[PDB]
Ligand binder design. Structure first.
Ligand code: ICS
Ligand code: ICS
Ligand SMILES: [Fe+3]
Ligand SMILES: [Fe+3]
Ligand code: NA
Ligand code: NA
Lengths: 522, 476, 522, 474
């Protein structure tokens, strides 16, 4: 039933008595469900010392991964170029998934096409898809560039992207001078960040490799900035903001901030902003190239050093205090620009917030996950804050990365109780927050089901989720936030300290029971 | 204006290369009451032209996403690389009652996470290992399905041998499903492949069963996936009418419920497209008849309640009128409040395989007019039915392209658009109210009388929202 | 007892069994406390309509006020001028309170002095306190200006601020040319916002009134901006940012952004930034003067129109979409500058966020409080968002203000169930959220004790607090936020929708009970 | 040291005009100092315009003494400023149902407007008393905390209290704690102690109902900051004593009214509560002693001194308590003293802590190089001389400029003071702990409190943030 003035959605409609009895009768009549006490026994078993050991014996089964597949990152990389249409050579279902994945995180349109390779293309290759695909896409959506990647179907059957695009130009489906950069992105290799790296290198390949004879390193007196897989609008904007403040000529290579944030003013803009093709052609003339997230830009690095002849600085992701300091000092050395009073003051304000908030942050234990560069920057900042990154999980990390992070934990007393896990997933992490319970989780929206599980064992055991990372689907407009630089460190600090205080307020809300500690001032 | 819709159709086709122009011309039609052939106004269930940005999905989404995923006490293995299981993880709101991770597993993502080494040597040995690890860590699962992604067939694996060997080894139901994304043209073939996998590996498990206590009023809800509780709000009404719902497929469904479906007296098919296959088989093998019904809006629900009841005896028909009389003032209060707020407004739809025609009556129950609908993967029997639901001279479009859908909106200028997540923010930026007719915009249920109140409330809040008045800066 | 590796603070230490029994024996032995069931009976009574009717018959008793006294605002106003020392002529206890009040909201030093008027000033006035006070402060803390207000003791005994400062200069305690503006700020008149108005008018008086002959309106082609009582750093910064983007010459009169946010870089800065004495001297030469919070700047208004001959525009506080539009359109007209593409795009981005989040905001009911201008701007924005500001309370509002807000509620269908309360306090508001329960509160930190009370009746009845306003003591660094302009509207929108969704997640976290609606994507 | 402090003292004073320089010379001392009278003056007027940290007599009555009494409603009589700025600012912890039977963190006020200045607030107060009784029926007494204007305008709150008290058979306590009375919160303590004596303490002098025991005791001058008194009574009762009452921390009016029954008054805060303690000795014969529950050394010394005032059973249980907590606080020092040893601290607090916490710092191997009070008296400074070391710096009612300048030359590793000082020195790169509100931590009393105190001093002194005050490029 419904009362017209007060409509009930699924919650709490199905808590009505008649819906509750019906759901009880459906279960007892036809579901053959394990008795509740058998369910409770097993749930308790799944939280134990025992279950975790078996859980970490897994070799074949993955449960609740913390990574996506390559072509997802190739799409995001392609969206950062001017009037560029990302184009995934393979099956259509992938593209609908890529688009929907980014639609929900950015709450924005995401334009991307497939060439609809079918069962028949598996037997004789997808070259006809490529020729008609390029021609249709160019004619219908009018892009200045089409950046081509692959689904796993195209990879396994061996479609040669290079030959296929060349034949599409040969037989006149697209003009010969029309830019069609490409990159193979097998979903069974690496993860979504690898697809970003492969795509960017392919695009850098296209506009540069054959034109090096006229290139002089540093002639454009600029610094190239490669952001990598990045899903916070504020991270693109804070990097450009700091460089402009320093008066440093720069070129952001792949910059999707405009297309991922168009205004609602009565018209739909398929393309907006992005790195121009000329900025790509002129990149070799830069003083140097800075990789913002080097641990998933390895191939790009080799090309920037091998072909552009740039000596890429060894810089960590600009997260936290020390690593933003190092980023700014290295930019100052390359560009000759001094760090201005404006950025030195912003630094002191971040340190000020650390001094005012250290009494509530000190010793707080965290479980966290994400991409390799995002994770280690979060690790470093938590140490600078006096926190303990107890569980550090990176599903798509490698051994070299884990060693660099282990070295960081060793240089601080707050890394004493910390362990770095690679190749493990969120079901592994579920065990850790039960066995070695932390105070909070820092992770994406998938982590909400882990807090779900912890609360079921008991309120005392609940581990609240702090949403930082990708993807964040159950909150609105957090994709606008910043995690890099001092500004991003200021946002992370405030979120962390206030999550602690909101949880303290919750635990001291009980009148006459615990509200003696329900202080107005904290 | 039939002439203007047909000139609008040609105009938008003028952008395409000729091969795309000749194909798309056959999927764009203007409905005409003098014709319900479908085989003469529009073609469907064809290739998606390359490079035109189809809204379609794949056969994996049609099997794992749509039919198999919702089955709550089984664990469903996304067999292949990392992508498919992750992009599909808890994306569809197939609601269920259960203890997730212990006896229920819908919202989780089990996968074999194919590495290159599984491409080289094959994933059959990894799959058997994974089945054992599933059995160690999740002992209370009542079955396992293996949802084949793209590379499985490509490399030549045999999930069927693994399933029979491991199934016998563990005396457990293990369902191999050949739903690789390259098979077919859309999610549709995933429905068919999944229906056949159900038939072959699950449905017949209790053929020799003689314990199930049968009643004359036993029924099953076929093709309701409980988006936001759609099937729960449909089951309340059937059981108030005196029927006993033995099973629901796949929304909040258990494997035992599926296995007991051969026992029922009547199969109630909501989604014809995804579930007509297994319904015909149960009529041929077990003799159980099946009928289609519509629980969208008060008009269709009442028409459905009376048609279902007529298939039984006078006692059920009497209770049918009791249900109708009980909810009569409630849905009348909903219409009295919201229809004045929505009457005369025009709606354009584009969804999957049923809803593009099924929700029209509900919009009309609030006095709105569907000036355009379309499906992503419908067949000509879906379009035959759409012709009796749609009005004269309205525009119909099959597997519409993003460019086509944009252009069509620009000329027709509907007051509301109902479609999917990839379309929502395009038209919101154009200043046209949008309601998601897949996930119900995280609202719902929309089925039954209780759902009409939410559906009506949702259409009102968005179409009449103050934000739409503010798209133009006062100085522009 | 304590475990060395896990020290327990007051919470949860006092939940230990031995402390629980001790507290039980203290109560039963010597507290003579009312029986628990009598406490429950009275609590339930205090939530009823009956009680509310009695609560609203109050004429003498105020309980839990939502306002401070005048000199508090006079201090904040003075801190916004360059190297200015706020100086409150009266008793010293007030100043310790003013400083501590602002210390805890801004987590920053607050410089303010008193002249320690004692019992003996009651009989012979505080003139010796003024002469020695000015001289000491000027000599010790090296201010460039001393801005004088009054405590209520000085007001009641009738100290002539004008004569006291003039004689302090005559007898050589301070230099004659040393700037000493003053303003009477009786705590028994108006509220803290009135003290801000009184102080600013006194300072404008000081530097201009005797010099109007040489003034030509518009000669410096600037616009004067008076912010009023403002405790969000981002509100000062967003106004200056939008005008600079517009290329509009402006003078922010009273700007404490620098001194309320100095960097921790090893030295303490008593003064930082602020409006210069010249900007005040030259203010009459501006094209016009815009009052950002006009409903507590009337005295200032009359002086700017009466003496500077400026035609102050009829503008609402720039909060929300319509009023930021009107603010920018009026600035464009006065200055001749067009509204730039950057601000037109930012507007479209705010509208885009409104379209993406309207389904969760629609119909949501709010009880809110604060200062008059902040409140009506929050009301206006909530109506633009499809939400219902059911309880609108302004303890220091007046009748004309209530009429302007009532007119606003009448022009929108979302103000239909709304009532505006003036002169009522937070004990009144407690009753309203019980009898006419909303979904959330938007208010300052005092509102936390109302949510406490609501939860005690039942989880169904809990009204969660959304912290916007002044003072915010139980969270860290929210004073850095913005509430004005499009940027502030973007922050408020995000805060509101995510508070709604965080509460939905809490209510749907119970496994097998309510987690059918625990959606990953919202 | 010695000449190095004395020259720092004169060096900083050269900025003042001579009248302020001459006065402030008398309030700055370096530690035959058995007699305060003789090396520093205290409890005088503050110099105008020098930014004193002091408060008022209202803060001394409503803020510290009366406010914490949980089952009474305390009326801030006057304008809105005083009740609002002190609302829930002091963490005088209590158990109760706020708004129903307890009212500590609420703000009751008459909200003086100009009409009340003109015609007087005596009729408004009587009407307010009635409104309190209808809406808060479970209050067991009312106090009227006068703010500045009450005495200046010529009100008579004693008559209102006497008239209304009879009509309603209710305890109504007039407190004339107007902020201009005195030079600080000190007189508010004195005014509040006398208001207790005159209007509350004598209500059960002829009532010999309460069954007394030889071990009945009262905690006088513990306001339960973060639970300080709870962490103290548990030790006294484990020793076998019965704490009849705590004043005013989590204290009830009935508890206060039963204090004349006890055998011994345990005074923690001498400054704020010595007045009523001497009075109960004169009228009821109850002796009183001072004690210290800051750190294990002082707590043990206090437990054994308190126990010595009883019989062998209490002295025996004293050693049992000491032996129980011995391994606990030994683990705390073993963990934290290595991390704090040799570090130097400067303090500046109200009227007791500046001397009361020295032993706790030394239990962690720290050295208090400077302490001072806002509103202490010469008997507080006499007691300070024994606790402080040779050549340390003493300062009475210090100016913000003085306190900054002193820190700049001494360079302590930690500063212990209040909220108005915290963010000054944090920006200077010096670790700071609030020694008023315990920085929202605590308790710090007793053995359970020493663990928190040590953890708090460690977490702040050794925090990584302090090494980042200087940008690597300057
Ligand atoms: S199954 Fe089908 S696309 Fe019939 S694949 Fe799709 S939950 Fe749609 S129009 Mo998403 S044939 Fe169901 C559908 Fe309809 S996922 Fe849902 S809304 S009624
Ligand atoms: S009462 Fe006094 S200023 Fe003895 S007015 Fe003050 S809660 Fe201080 S040094 Mo705040 S004489 Fe208590 C005090 Fe000490 S408020 Fe607290 S910390 S031990
Ligand atoms: Fe958007
Ligand atoms: Fe600060
Ligand atoms: Na795919
Ligand atoms: Na005062």
């Amino acid at each position: 039933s419904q009362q017209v003035d007060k409509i009930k959605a699924s919650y709490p409609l199905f808590l009505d008595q008649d819906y509750k009895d019906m759901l009880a009768k459906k279960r007892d009549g036809f579901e053959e469900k394990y008795p509740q006490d058998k369910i409770d026994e097993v749930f308790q078993w799944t939280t134990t010392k025992e279950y975790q050991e078996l859980n970490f014996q897994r070799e074949a089964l993955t449960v609740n991964p913390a990574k996506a597949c390559q072509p997802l990152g190739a799409v995001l990389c392609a969206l950062g170029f001017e009037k560029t249409m990302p184009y995934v050579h393979g099956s259509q279902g992938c593209v609908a998934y890529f688009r929907s994945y980014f639609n929900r995180h950015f709450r924005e349109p995401v334009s991307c096409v497939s060439d609809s390779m079918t069962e028949d293309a598996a037997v004789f290759g997808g070259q006809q898809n490529m020729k008609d695909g390029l021609q249709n896409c160019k004619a219908t959506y009018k892009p200045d560039m089409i950046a081509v990647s692959t689904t796993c179907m195209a990879e396994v059957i061996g479609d040669d992207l290079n030959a296929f695009i060349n034949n599409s130009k040969k037989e006149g489906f697209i003009p010969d001078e029309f830019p069609v950069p490409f990159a193979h992105t097998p979903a069974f290799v690496g993860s979504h960040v690898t697809g970003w790296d492969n795509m960017f290198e392919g695009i850098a390949r296209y506009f540069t490799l054959k034109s090096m004879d006229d290139k002089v390193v540093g002639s454009n007196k600029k610094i190239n900035i490669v952001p990598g897989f990045e899903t916070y609008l504020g991270n693109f904007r804070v990097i450009k903001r700091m460089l402009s403040e320093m008066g440093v000529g720069y070129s952001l290579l792949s910059d999707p901030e405009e297309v991922l944030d168009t205004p609602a003013d009565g018209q739909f803009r398929m393309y907006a902003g992005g790195t121009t093709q000329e900025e790509m052609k002129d990149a070799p003339n830069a003083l140097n190239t800075v990789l913002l997230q080097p641990w998933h830009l390895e191939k790009t690095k080799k090309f920037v050093e091998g072909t552009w002849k740039h000596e890429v600085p060894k810089l960590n992701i600009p997260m936290g205090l020390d690593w933003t300091d190092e980023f700014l000092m290295k930019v100052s050395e390359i560009s000759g620009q001094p760090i201005p009073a404006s950025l030195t003051k912003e630094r002191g304000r971040l340190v000020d917030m650390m001094t005012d908030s250290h009494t509530w942050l000190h010793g707080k234990r965290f479980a966290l996950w994400g991409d390799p560069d995002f994770v280690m920057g979060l690790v470093k900042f938590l140490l600078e804050l006096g926190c303990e990154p107890v569980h550090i999980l990176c599903h798509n990390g490698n051994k070299r990365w884990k060693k660099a992070v282990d070295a960081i934990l060793a240089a601080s007393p707050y890394g004493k109780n910390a362990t770095v896990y690679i190749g493990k997933d969120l079901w592994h992490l579920r065990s850790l927050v039960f066995t070695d319970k932390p105070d909070f989780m820092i992770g994406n929206s998938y982590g909400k089901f882990i807090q779900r599980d912890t609360l079921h064992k008991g309120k005392e055991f609940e581990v609240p989720l702090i949403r930082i990372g990708f993807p964040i689907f159950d909150r609105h407009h957090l994709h606008r936030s910043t995690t890099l630089g001092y500004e991003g460190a200021m946002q992370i600090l405030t979120t962390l300290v206030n999550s602690i205080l909101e949880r303290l307020d919750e635990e001291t809300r009980g009148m006459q029971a615990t509200d003696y500690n329900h202080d107005l001032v904290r | 204006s039939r002439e203007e819709v047909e000139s609008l159709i040609q105009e938008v086709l003028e952008v395409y290369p000729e091969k795309a122009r000749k194909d798309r011309n056959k999927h764009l039609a203007v409905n005409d009451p003098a014709v319900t052939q479908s085989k003469k106004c529009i073609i469907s269930n064809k290739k998606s032209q390359p490079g035109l940005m189809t809204i379609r999905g794949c056969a994996y989404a049609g099997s794992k996403g749509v039919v198999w995923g919702p089955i709550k006490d089984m664990i469903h293995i996304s067999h292949g690389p990392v992508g498919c299981g992750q992009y599909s993880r808890a994306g569809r709101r197939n609601y269920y009652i259960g203890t997730t991770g212990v006896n229920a597993f819908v919202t989780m993502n089990f996968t074999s996470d194919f590495q290159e080494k599984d491409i080289v040597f094959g994933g059959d040995k990894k799959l058997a290992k994974l089945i054992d690890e599933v059995e160690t860590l999740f002992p209370l699962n009542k079955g396992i399905s293996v949802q084949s992604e793209c590379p499985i067939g490509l490399i030549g694996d045999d999930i069927e041998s693994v399933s029979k060997v491991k199934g016998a080894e563990l005396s457990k139901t293990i369902v191999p499903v050949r739903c690789e994304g390259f098979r077919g043209v859309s999610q549709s073939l995933g429905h068919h492949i999944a229906n056949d996998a159900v038939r072959d590996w699950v449905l017949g498990k209790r053929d020799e069963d003689t314990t199930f206590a049968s009643t004359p009023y036993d029924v099953a809800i076929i093709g309701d996936y409980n988006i936001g509780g759609d099937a729960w709000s449909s089951r309340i009404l059937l059981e108030e009418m005196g029927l006993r719902c033995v099973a629901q497929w796949s929304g909040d469904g258990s494997i035992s419920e599926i296995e007991l479906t051969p026992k029922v007296k009547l199969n109630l098919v909501h989604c014809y497209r995804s579930m007509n296959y297994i319904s015909r088989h149960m009529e041929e093998k077990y003799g159980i008849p099946w009928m289609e019904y519509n629980f969208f809006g008060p008009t269709k629900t009442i028409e459905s309640l009376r048609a279902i009841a007529a298939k039984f005896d006078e006692s059920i028909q009497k209770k049918c009128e009791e249900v109708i009389a009980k909810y009569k003032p409630e849905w009348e209060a909903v219409v009295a409040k919201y229809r004045p707020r929505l009457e005369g407004k025009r709606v354009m739809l584009y969804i999957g395989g049923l809803r593009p025609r099924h929700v029209i009556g509900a919009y009309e129950d609030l006095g709105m007019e569907v000036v355009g609908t379309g499906y992503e993967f419908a067949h000509n029997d879906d379009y035959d039915r759409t012709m009796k639901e749609m009005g004269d001279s309205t525009l119909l479009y099959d597997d519409v392209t993003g460019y086509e859908f944009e252009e069509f909106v620009k000329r027709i200028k509907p007051d509301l658009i109902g479609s999917g997540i990839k379309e929502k923010f395009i038209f919101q930026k154009m200043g046209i109210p949008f309601r998601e007719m897949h996930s119900w915009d995280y609202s719902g249920p929309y089925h039954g009388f209780d759902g009409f109140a939410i559906f009506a409330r949702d259409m009102d809040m968005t179409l009449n929202n103050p934000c739409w008045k503010k798209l133009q800066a006062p100085w522009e």
